[PDB]
Amino acid sequence: KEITNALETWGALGQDINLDIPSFQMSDDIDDIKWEKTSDKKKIAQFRKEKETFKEKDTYKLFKNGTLKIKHLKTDDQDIYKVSIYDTKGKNVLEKIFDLKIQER
Numbered sequence: 001k002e003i004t005n006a007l008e009t010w011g012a013l014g015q016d017i018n019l020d021i022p023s024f025q026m027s028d029d030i031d032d033i034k035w036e037k038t039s040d041k042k043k044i045a046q047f048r049k050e051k052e053t054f055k056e057k058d059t060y061k062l063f064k065n066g067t068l069k070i071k072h073l074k075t076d077d078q079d080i081y082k083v084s085i086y087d088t089k090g091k092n093v094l095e096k097i098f099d100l101k102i103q104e105r
């Protein structure tokens with residue numbers, strides 16, 4: 001069967017949610033950490049060594065363990081995401097697809 005391997009991500013309106021990617025604990029050989037806005041392929045966060053790494057606001061954070069945070073999570077802040085976190089060789093040492101949702105409990 002051909003399916004995805006994404007993370008069923010959930011939230012609630014007026015909330016703050018995260019993006020837990022790491023299936024591992026790399027450290028010694030890693031370089032780049034990336035997160036995109038899959039909906040329209042729109043850069044939200046990135047790491048490219050200590051010469052150029054960025055995160056516009058808290059609304060989208062890039063962390064050490066490699067998680068991506070997001071503050072304020074209403075219907076508007078619910079989107080689709082993906083993480084590509086590469087090593088020094090420039091390989092995609094791990095890749096994954098995510099999807100923020102909103103719930104009604």
Ligand SMILES: *[C@@H]1O[C@H](CO)[C@@H](O[C@@H]2O[C@H](CO)[C@@H](O[C@@H]3O[C@H](CO[C@H]4O[C@H](CO[C@H]5O[C@H](CO)[C@@H](O)[C@H](O)[C@@H]5O[C@H]5O[C@H](CO)[C@@H](O)[C@H](O)[C@@H]5O)[C@@H](O)[C@H](O[C@H]5O[C@H](CO)[C@@H](O)[C@H](O)[C@@H]5O)[C@@H]4O)[C@@H](O)[C@H](O[C@H]4O[C@H](CO)[C@@H](O)[C@H](O)[C@@H]4O[C@H]4O[C@H](CO)[C@@H](O)[C@H](O)[C@@H]4O)[C@@H]3O)[C@H](O)[C@H]2NC(C)=O)[C@H](O)[C@H]1NC(C)=O
Binds near residue numbers: 067
């Ligand atoms: C990857 O990394 C991520 C982070 O690096 C990580 O996410 C983090 O996860 C942890 C938990 O795993 C989260 O921590 C929780 O925090 C709750 C309280 O939070 C509020 O207070 C914090 C501390 O306050 C600072 O600021 C005050 C200023 O007024 C000072 O007075 C304080 O002294 C203190 O200062 C310190 O920090 C400063 C930096 O800000 C620093 O300068 C200073 O020197 C000093 O060190 C605030 O930081 C925090 O603010 C954040 O969050 C709010 C939203 O709430 C935002 O608005 C802010 O903008 C900001 O982002 C808050 O105000 C705790 O209650 C909670 O405790 C529970 O969990 C622990 C651990 O398991 C238990 O021991 C404990 O008993 C509690 O358990 C209870 O609940 C659970 C349910 O969860 C339940 O099961 C259990 O039975 C029990 O009932 C916890 O500690 C942290 O917030 C996350 N983010 C960050 C940035 O750390 C992520 O998980 C990682 N990913 C992976 C995959 O591993």
